Design a protein around this ligand. Sequence first.
Ligand SMILES: O=C(OCCOC(=O)[C@@H]1CCCCN1S(=O)(=O)Cc1ccccc1)c1cccnc1
Ligand SMILES: [Mg+2]
Length: 186
Amino acid sequence: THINLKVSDGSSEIFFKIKKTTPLRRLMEAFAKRQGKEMDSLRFLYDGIRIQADQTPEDLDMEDNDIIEAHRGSTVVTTESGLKYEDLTEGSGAEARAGQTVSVHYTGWLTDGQKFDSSKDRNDPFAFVLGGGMVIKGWDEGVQGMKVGGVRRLTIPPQLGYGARGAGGVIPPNATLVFEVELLDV
Ligand SMILES: O=C(OCCOC(=O)[C@@H]1CCCCN1S(=O)(=O)Cc1ccccc1)c1cccnc1
Ligand SMILES: [Mg+2]
C-alpha cells in the first residue's frame, strides 16, 4: 500500500513514506519546503525522466526505497587552487574586487548536506574586507568577480577552508565546505 522513497540533492538524502495511490506533488512540496524554496525552482527526476507533480508512485512503477534526484544551464568552474564555483544567479550590479568591504548573505553546509552556519538565521548580512585574510581563503578567492545580485555556490577544499584542525564543535578535520553566497553590496 505505502512506499518509502529517498530524495537526494547530491549531498542530503531525505526519506518519505507516502501512499502509492497519491500524486507526488505533496512529496515534492514537502522536500522543497525544508529547503525554504518554491517548488517551481526544483526539477525532480526518477530514472531519468522528469516527474510531473500529477504522477503517482504506482503510475511510475516505483519500488520500495527507490531514489529521486533533485536539481535546479549549470556551469561548474574549477580554479587552479582546487576551488570550485558555480554562479546560480548572475549579478548585474557592480563587481566585487579585492580591497572592498563587501556585504553578503550566506549558508554553509558540510558535504553531507548538514548546515553549520547562516547569516540568514539572525537575518544579519555579513561584511568583510575582500582579500584581507579575515575569512577562510576560499572566500577571499571565491567572492572576487561576483556582481551585486549574484548567487554563487562555493565548494571549498579543506586547505582553502579550516584545514586539518577544523572548527570547534562543528566542522570536522579535512572537511570540504559548501557555501551559497549572495552579494548584497560592494
Ligand atoms: O568572523 C566571523 O566569521 C569568521 C570567519 O568565518 C569564515 O571565514 C567563513 C567564511 C565567511 C562566512 C563565515 N564563515 S563560517 O565557516 O561559517 C565560520 C563558522 C561558523 C559557524 C561554525 C564554524 C565556523 C563572523 C561571522 C558572523 C558573525 N560574526 C563574525
Ligand atoms: Mg551584519
